[PDB]
Ligand binder design. Structure first.
Ligand SMILES: O=C(Nc1ccc(Oc2ncccn2)cc1C(=O)O)c1ccc(Cl)cc1Cl
Lengths: 10, 272
């Protein structure tokens, strides 16, 4: 999934 | 190909300039400031020096460190790591401002970051280094290449390869104007494992490679073939990261009580 990197892209 | 003024050229230059400004806005210590500190050109700062266990303590008291009892190697490891999760956030902000990047499919942006982050880290680390050591703590300490080699079995072989690269890299005498484009080139790499839609990646990239060629022509009369030495550098790096990941395997299974930061585990995840 990569939840954190995802959340960083906002 | 060639040596006439391109009619795309002002764009290229507008692009270069766009990235150079976001670069300084996302990267608090640039190469210029860093060379300044190691030049004793600016006075305000003079970094404390860490050359032995004795001066470790001394400096760990005169520098406000944002990690920090546990053992030295680890304390140092802890802090390379914190600076590291910090450079992730700064790399993400910069990425996001490369024209074209935010309209890529988000799935793919995640991949391009996961693979580029450590590559970038390593080139930004070169700015902070000579063959003697690294500026640490936003330019407030100087830590010694030899003292780092002095730490115990796993830990004192983790910076050497990055110093090994820095010496070779710094020999191109690149500056912040060259580096801001290099970095957007790195990030925007269509060779990444797992990219679902690569064409629009490759597009943005050609354009950055144009921007880069042009930039190196204007900025560097001194060397006839720097653009290519740099293209070559992009390859060395992926091999350096592989070494980094592989090592980190050892450490992970040599130190109980570890815990790598969750952001870092994520990148490390299924990585080559
Ligand atoms: O290795 C780095 N920094 C640190 C490493 C260890 C450390 O740990 C610290 N140093 C000496 C003694 C005790 N603790 C602190 C830092 C830092 O930047 O502050 C580092 C990591 C990534 C990047 Cl981009 C830059 C740096 Cl300078």
């Amino acid at each position: 999934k990569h939840k954190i990197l995802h959340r960083l892209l906002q | 190909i060639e040596g006439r003024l391109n009619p795309e050229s002002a764009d290229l230059r507008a692009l270069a300039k766009h990235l150079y400004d976001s670069y300084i806005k996302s990267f608090p210590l640039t190469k210029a400031k860093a060379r300044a500190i190691l030049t004793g050109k600016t006075t305000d700062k003079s970094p404390f020096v860490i050359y032995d266990m004795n001066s470790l303590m001394m400096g760990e008291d005169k520098i406000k460190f944002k990690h920090i009892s546990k053992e030295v190697a680890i304390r140092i490891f802890q802090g390379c790591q914190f600076r590291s999760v910090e450079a992730v956030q700064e790399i993400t902000e910069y990425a996001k401002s490369i024209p074209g990047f935010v309209n890529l499919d988000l799935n793919d942006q995640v991949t391009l970051l996961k693979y580029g982050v450590h590559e970038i880290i390593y080139t930004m680390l070169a700015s902070l280094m000579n063959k003697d050591g690294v500026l640490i703590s936003e330019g407030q300490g100087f830590m010694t290449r030899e003292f780092l080699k002095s730490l115990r079995k796993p830990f004192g072989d983790f910076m050497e390869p990055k110093f090994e690269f820095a010496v070779k890299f710094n020999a191109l005498e690149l500056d912040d104007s060259d580096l801001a484009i290099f970095i957007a080139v790195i990030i925007l790499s269509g060779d990444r494992p797992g990219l679902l839609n690569v064409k629009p990646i490759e597009d943005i990239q050609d354009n950055l490679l144009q921007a880069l060629e042009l930039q190196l022509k204007l900025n560097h009369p001194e060397s006839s073939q720097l653009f290519a030495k740099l293209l070559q550098k992009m390859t060395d790096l992926r091999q350096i990261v592989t070494e980094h990941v592989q090592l980190l395997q050892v450490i992970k299974k040599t130190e109980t009580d570890m815990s790598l930061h969750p952001l870092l585990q994520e990148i490390y995840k299924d990585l080559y």
